Amino acid sequence: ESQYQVGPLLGGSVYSGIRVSDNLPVAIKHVEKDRISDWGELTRVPMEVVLLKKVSSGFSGVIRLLDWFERPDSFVLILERPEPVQDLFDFITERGALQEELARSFFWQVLEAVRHCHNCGVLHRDIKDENILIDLNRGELKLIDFGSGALLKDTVYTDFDGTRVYSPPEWIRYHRYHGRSAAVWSLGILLYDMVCGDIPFEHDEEIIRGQVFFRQRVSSECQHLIRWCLALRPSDRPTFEEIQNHPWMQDVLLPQETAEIHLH
Numbered sequence: 001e002s003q004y005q006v007g008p009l010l011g012g013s014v015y016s017g018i019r020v021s022d023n024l025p026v027a028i029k030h031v032e033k034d035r036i037s038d039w040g041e042l043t044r045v046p047m048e049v050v051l052l053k054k055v056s057s058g059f060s061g062v063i064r065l066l067d068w069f070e071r072p073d074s075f076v077l078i079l080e081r082p083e084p085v086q087d088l089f090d091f092i093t094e095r096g097a098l099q100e101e102l103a104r105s106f107f108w109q110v111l112e113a114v115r116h117c118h119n120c121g122v123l124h125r126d127i128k129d130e131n132i133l134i135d136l137n138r139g140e141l142k143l144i145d146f147g148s149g150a151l152l153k154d155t156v157y158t159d160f161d162g163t164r165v166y167s168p169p170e171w172i173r174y175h176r177y178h179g180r181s182a183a184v185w186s187l188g189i190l191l192y193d194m195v196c197g198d199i200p201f202e203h204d205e206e207i208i209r210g211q212v213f214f215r216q217r218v219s220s221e222c223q224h225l226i227r228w229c230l231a232l233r234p235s236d237r238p239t240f241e242e243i244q245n246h247p248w249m250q251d252v253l254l255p256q257e258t259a260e261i262h263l264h
């Protein structure tokens with residue numbers, strides 16, 4: 001490709017790139033056809049591409065798919081890349097447990113991104129700190145990696161290939177879930193991770209048990225929201241609207257304010 005300039009590897013095979021035509025930073029993602037259990041279309045593509053095209057309309061919250069190419073043994077995806085960027089997993093490794101004000105700003109922007117995906121008929125299925133980029137200058141979070149996603153539907157899902165420690169007990173125990181409620185569980189895991197510095201459950205037994213112990217000082221409202229998202233019963237979990245109207249979610253900072261206060 002002379003239409004992009006390839007740079008160094010970000011980490012799976014995704015590379016820093018630069019769109020030759022206008023120097024737009026980009027990430028160039030290579031997906032081997034071997035590793036695709038999920039195909040779709042409009043001719044034959046990875047489902048990850050179908051889902052990206054559905055979420056890449058307009059702005060934002062989700063890293064957009066700008067173009068893609070097919071190769072003999074692989075597809076190549078050209079995605080947005082903010083600059084500077086750092087993913088939520090490193091940010092958490094570096095900074096430890098986040099102050100609640102920062103965690104609320106972040107968790108909200110995630111809630112918006114996930115609602116965007118849902119509105120577009122897309123279910124992500126692997127929401128977790130590693131799958132979230134922070135644009136360090138705009139305080140904006142951007143969801144990446146639809147590689148485990150599906151079309152949103154209202155019936156039961158009987159396959160999952162996301163991250164186990166973020167999967168809910170109805171998956172662990174029955175190999176079934178519904179989209180929204182499973183998503184809300186992962187969002188509960190993510191929030192605990194933001195406020196505690198780490199994920200609450202390592203092993204199936206602690207997932208099935210869904211008892212949450214706090215290793216850090218976390219306020220009541222925040223702990224109540226987390227336990228709400230991690231209700232054992234999928235129908236006892238809040239909807240996105242209920243989560244965004246929870247007291248702990250009031251008075252969120254703008255992304256810009258978030259960067260100026262918490263990101264330098």
Ligand SMILES: N#CC1C(=O)c2ccccc2C1=O
Nearest residue numbers: 014027063079080081144145
């Ligand atoms: N999936 C995916 C990629 C993705 O969408 C992205 C964008 C910027 C920097 C890294 C990445 C990813 O790893």
